[PDB]
Nucleic acid binder design. Structure first.
Ligand SMILES: [Mg+2]
Ligand SMILES: [Mg+2]
Lengths: 38, 135, 136, 134, 94
RNA sequence: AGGAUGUUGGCUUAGAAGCAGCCAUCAUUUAAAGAAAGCGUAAUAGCUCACUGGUCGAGUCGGCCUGCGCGGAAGAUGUA
C-alpha cells in the first residue's frame, strides 16, 4: 500500500474508489499499484 | 469508426455488385479463423465470386434496391454474403462443403430468381452444373 | 541561470508586485504557459522548468523564455543582527503578475506541448495555465 | 509443431537444427535426409522455410515453402547482408523485373490477388531491408 | 455568416462595465464611417463561442440592434488577462 | 467471435521470431487486425490490447465556466 497525498491511476487496470471518505486506487493486475490518499 | 459518408459509400458499392451478380449466398461465418477465410477468398477469386462481410443494417439498405428484399430476414446475426457475379452457383456449392468440412458456422438462406432459398433445399443451386454442360 | 550581464546598481528596493501583467498573449510560438498567480520567479526555478520542458520534447522545436530575472534579492547571513547596511545579493528574480506568458513553444504537437508544460509547471511556485496562439 | 528455415540440400547440425526440434520429440536423421531428399531440386544455397508437423507419437510430416523475401532480395541485389540501417543506408538495387520474379515465386507463396499486389509486398520487404529498387 | 444580437448601453464607465461582466455580458463599440459611435452590450458566452472560429475575424458580421442590422468587421478584442473571457470588442462599420 | 499473409522485416546476438537494443514501419488478404500496447519464453510457444463483425437497445463520452464540500492535516498537565 502506497500512502501518499497524490493518488493516481498507474495503469489501465487501476480503478479509483472512495471508501469511507478515503480516495483509494485498486488494481486487479499490479498489487504495487494499490494506493490510498493520506 | 465509420462516418456517415463512409457507410453511404459502403452501401453504394455493395449495391452495384448486387446488380451485376446472379446468385447470392448468405451465411454465418462467426468462429472461423482468418486463415480459413483467406483460403475461402482464394476459392472465391478463383471461382469468380465476390465476398464481403457487411453490417446487417447496411446490407438491408442497398439490398432493398433491386430483387434482394426476401433476404432481409437472413440479416439477423453475423452475416457473410457471396456474390457470384460471373456464372451462377459455384458459391452455393463452395460454401456447403466448406460449411460441412469446418463444422463452425452454418449457412442461412441463399437467393436466386428473386426468390429466397431455404437453408436445407439450397442443394438445388449446389448441384447446378456448368454453362458448357448443355453441349 | 539567467542574470543581467551588468547593472547600473547592485541592490534594489523591495518594491511591490501589484497590477496585471504585460505581454499576455503568445507572440512567438504557438503554445504558451501563462501564469494565473502572482509572485516571484527565481533564476533557478526558470532554469529548472526549462530543463523539464526541454527534455520533455526531447530537444525538439523552439522554446522561448518570455521572462528574465532582472531584480536582485539580498539576504543577511545567519547570526547577524538588524542594521549595518543592506544585505548582499544572493539571487535574481522576475516579478510575475497574473496573465504573464512565461514560456512559448513551437514545432511540436499540442498534446505533446501540454505534457511538456505540465512537467514544467510542477517546478514553478505560481499557478499557471495552458494557452494557444489566437488571431488578434 | 515447429517452423524452421533450413539450407537446401543441408540438414542435421546441432546448433542449427538438432536441439530446436530435437527437444520436441522429432527423429533427426529421418527429417534431415527426407528434407534434403525433396529440397535437392532447389537451387544451391537457397535458404528454404519448412514447417515441421509432429504428432503425439513423435512421428512427423512437413511442408516446404518458397524461400524468404529477404533471402531472394539479398540474392537479387547480389549482396549478403541487409542494411544495418534500412532507408538510412541503401544497399542493393533490384529492377522492377527482379521484384516481379521474386513476386511470382513468393506468389506461389503470397496472398495477393494480382502480380502488382505481390510485387508491392516484395517491394515492402525490399524497403524494409534498405535495398532500393533500381 | 455570423449574426449578433445586441442592446444599446444605458451608461458607461468602470462601474457600469464591471456590472455587465458580472451579469454574463460585456460591452462593445461600433465606430467607422460618418455616423456617431454606438455603445452596445453583448451576451458573453454566445459571442465567446463564435470568436473561437478563425473566420470570425475575417468575414463581415451583422449585429442586429433595435431590430436593425449593421454590417461590421471585428477590429480589436480585449481579452481577460488570464481567463478565457472577453472584456471588450471594437467593431468597425464595413 | 475474429485479431491474418509476405514474415522469424533488416541489422545485431549464442538466441532476438511484434515485445533487450538499433533502423525501417511498407504491402497484401481484409469486416478488421500495429512489422505490435502490456504480460510471458533461453529463443519459440502461450495470454491480452489496438481494430472489426455480431448481440443488446437509447442515451452515453470528455473538456470549459462556476457554488459548496473531501484528502493533504503529527505535540507535549485536560476535552482544549
Ligand atoms: Mg470603483
Ligand atoms: Mg491530550
Amino acid at each position: 500500500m502506497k500512502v501518499r497525498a497524490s493518488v493516481k491511476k498507474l495503469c489501465r487496470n487501476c480503478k479509483i474508489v472512495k471508501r469511507d471518505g478515503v480516495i483509494r486506487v485498486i488494481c486487479s493486475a499490479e498489487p504495487k499499484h494499490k494506493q490510498r490518499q493520506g | 469508426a465509420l462516418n456517415l459518408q463512409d457507410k453511404q459509400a459502403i452501401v453504394a458499392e455493395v449495391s452495384e455488385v448486387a446488380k451485376g451478380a446472379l446468385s447470392a449466398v448468405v451465411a454465418d461465418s462467426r468462429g472461423v479463423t482468418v486463415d480459413k477465410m483467406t483460403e475461402l477468398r482464394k476459392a472465391g477469386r478463383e471461382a469468380g465470386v465476390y465476398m464481403r462481410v457487411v453490417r446487417n443494417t447496411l446490407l438491408r439498405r442497398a439490398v432493398e434496391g433491386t430483387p434482394f428484399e426476401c433476404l432481409k430476414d437472413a440479416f439477423v446475426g453475423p452475416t457473410l454474403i457471396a456474390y457470384v457475379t460471373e456464372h451462377p452457383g459455384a458459391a452455393a456449392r463452395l460454401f456447403k462443403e466448406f460449411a460441412k468440412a469446418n463444422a463452425k458456422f452454418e449457412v442461412k438462406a441463399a437467393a436466386f430468381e428473386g426468390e429466397l432459398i431455404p437453408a436445407s433445399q439450397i442443394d438445388r443451386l449446389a448441384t447446378l452444373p456448368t454453362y458448357e454442360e448443355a453441349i | 541561470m539567467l542574470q543581467p550581464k551588468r547593472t547600473k546598481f547592485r541592490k534594489m528596493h523591495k518594491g511591490r508586485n501589484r497590477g496585471l501583467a504585460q505581454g499576455t498573449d503568445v507572440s512567438f510560438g504557438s503554445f504558451g504557459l501563462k501564469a494565473v498567480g502572482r509572485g516571484r520567479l527565481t533564476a533557478r526555478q526558470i532554469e529548472a522548468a526549462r530543463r523539464a520542458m526541454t527534455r520533455a520534447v526531447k530537444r525538439q522545436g523552439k522554446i522561448w523564455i518570455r521572462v528574465f530575472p532582472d531584480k536582485p534579492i539580498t539576504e543577511k547571513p545567519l547570526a547577524v543582527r538588524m542594521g549595518k547596511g543592506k544585505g548582499n545579493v544572493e539571487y535574481w528574480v522576475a516579478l510575475i503578475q497574473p496573465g504573464k506568458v512565461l514560456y512559448e513553444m513551437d514545432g511540436v504537437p499540442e498534446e505533446l506541448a501540454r505534457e511538456a508544460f505540465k512537467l514544467a509547471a510542477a517546478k514553478l511556485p505560481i499557478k499557471t495555465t495552458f494557452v494557444t496562439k489566437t488571431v488578434m | 509443431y515447429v517452423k524452421l528455415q533450413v539450407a537446401a540440400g543441408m540438414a542435421n547440425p546441432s546448433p542449427p537444427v538438432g536441439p530446436a526440434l530435437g527437444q520436441q520429440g522429432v527423429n533427426i536423421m529421418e527429417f534431415c535426409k527426407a528434407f534434403n531428399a525433396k529440397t535437392d531440386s532447389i537451387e544451391k544455397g537457397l535458404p528454404i522455410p519448412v514447417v515441421i508437423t509432429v504428432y503425439a507419437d513423435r512421428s512427423f510430416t512437413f511442408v516446404t515453402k518458397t524461400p524468404p523475401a529477404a533471402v531472394l532480395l539479398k540474392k537479387a541485389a547480389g549482396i549478403k547482408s541487409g542494411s544495418g540501417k534500412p532507408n538510412k543506408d541503401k544497399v542493393g538495387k533490384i529492377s522492377r523485373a527482379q521484384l516481379q520474379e521474386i513476386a511470382q515465386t513468393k506468389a506461389a507463396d503470397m496472398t495477393g490477388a494480382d502480380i502488382e499486389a505481390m510485387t508491392r509486398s516484395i517491394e515492402g520487404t525490399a524497403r524494409s531491408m534498405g535495398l532500393v529498387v533500381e | 455568416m455570423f449574426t449578433i444580437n445586441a442592446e444599446v448601453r444605458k451608461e458607461q464607465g468602470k462601474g457600469a462595465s464591471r456590472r455587465l461582466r458580472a451579469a454574463n455580458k460585456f460591452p462593445a463599440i461600433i465606430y467607422g464611417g460618418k455616423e456617431a459611435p454606438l455603445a452596445i452590450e453583448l451576451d458573453h458566452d454566445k459571442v465567446m463561442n463564435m470568436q473561437a472560429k478563425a473566420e470570425f475575424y475575417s468575414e463581415v458580421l451583422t449585429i442586429v440592434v433595435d431590430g436593425k442590422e449593421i454590417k461590421v468587421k471585428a477590429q480589436d478584442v480585449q481579452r481577460h488577462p488570464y481567463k478565457p473571457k472577453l472584456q471588450h470588442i471594437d467593431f468597425v462599420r464595413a
